[PDB]
C-alpha cells in the first residue's frame, strides 16, 4: 500500500531524488534517510545525531537537531505528514 506525503515532507523527499507523489512507507523512509545522508546532516562521530539546523527538515520538525535513538518527534512529524 502507498501513502501520500503532505507538501512540506514531499519537498524533502523530492530533494533526495524521489519522484512522484505516492510511496510506500518504506520508500518514504528510504528517501528521508537519503536526504539526511546526502546532505551530510548526521554527526560522523555520533551517527544517531542529526543536525538539520534551519533546512527544510529542521523547519518541518521545529528543531535544529534530533536523535534517531529518540524517534518520537520523527514519528509525530511522519503522522502529521503522511496521508494513509
Amino acid at each position: 500500500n502507498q501513502v501520500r506525503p503532505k507538501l512540506p515532507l514531499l519537498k524533502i523527499l523530492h530533494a533526495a531524488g524521489a519522484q512522484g507523489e505516492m510511496f510506500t512507507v518504506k520508500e518514504v523512509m528510504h528517501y528521508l534517510g537519503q536526504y539526511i545522508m546526502v546532505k551530510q546532516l548526521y554527526d560522523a562521530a555520533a551517527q544517531h545525531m542529526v543536525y538539520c539546523g534551519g533546512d527544510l527538515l529542521g523547519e518541518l520538525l521545529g528543531r535544529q537537531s534530533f536523535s534517531v535513538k529518540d524517534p518520537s518527534p520523527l514519528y509525530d512529524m511522519l503522522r502529521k505528514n503522511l496521508v494513509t
Binding site: 523512509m29 539526511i36 545522508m37 534517531v68 535513538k69 520523527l74 514519528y75
Partner: peptide, 12 residues
Amino acid sequence: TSFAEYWNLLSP
C-alpha cells in the same frame, strides 16, 4: 553504528 544502521531500526 552508522547512521544507516540507526535509521533502519525506525518502524513508523
